[PDB]
Ligand binder design. Sequence first.
Ligand SMILES: [Cl-]
Ligand code: NA
Length: 216
Amino acid sequence: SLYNYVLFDLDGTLTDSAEGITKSVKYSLNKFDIQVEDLSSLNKFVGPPLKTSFMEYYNFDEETATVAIDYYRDYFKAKGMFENKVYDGIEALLSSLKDYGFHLVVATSKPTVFSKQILEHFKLAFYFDAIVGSSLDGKLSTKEDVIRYAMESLNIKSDDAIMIGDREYDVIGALKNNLPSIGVTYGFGSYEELKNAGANYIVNSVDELHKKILEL
Ligand SMILES: [Cl-]
Ligand code: NA
């Protein structure tokens, strides 16, 4: 069952971006006079499309969530994206995989423009064949839609790739594209969240992730 492609989500899988993201959300919510006790309570915003999150957690409508997304970006584009860190072992993982011959791709709900700046900023950009994110306008943004477009763009077949993510959204997006998925628990999703989502494989560390990708 040799497959050549490995798709990765960005936030919570490759980078520990909680600080910058939760701070951008807090900055945005505060503009609505919504206070938050501690950033940690905004961790759930890490991974899914911002729109879905603002609407779900704050009952905003389409247009209001869009305004909230813009405030978020005022801070994220200039400070938030940098209040980030690459998970330990990740670059080692990426290097090892390309050596094996795997083609690596980023498939994320995060806007492509930010994802590229971040990966280049962290010097990991060239490990990837493509970095496919959402469009700033949100026309293309759900996990299912970005994975589908990434596969279409690179002409990747369902039997030649797997999806790596930390949230149920990644599992659902993978399933919807007929791709097996490896969920990681070192991110912002829990074992239970991934198991109930249907994750095809679940690991608790980057090293475990490395091993699993191979024996797959
Ligand atoms: Cl973002
Ligand atoms: Na994620």
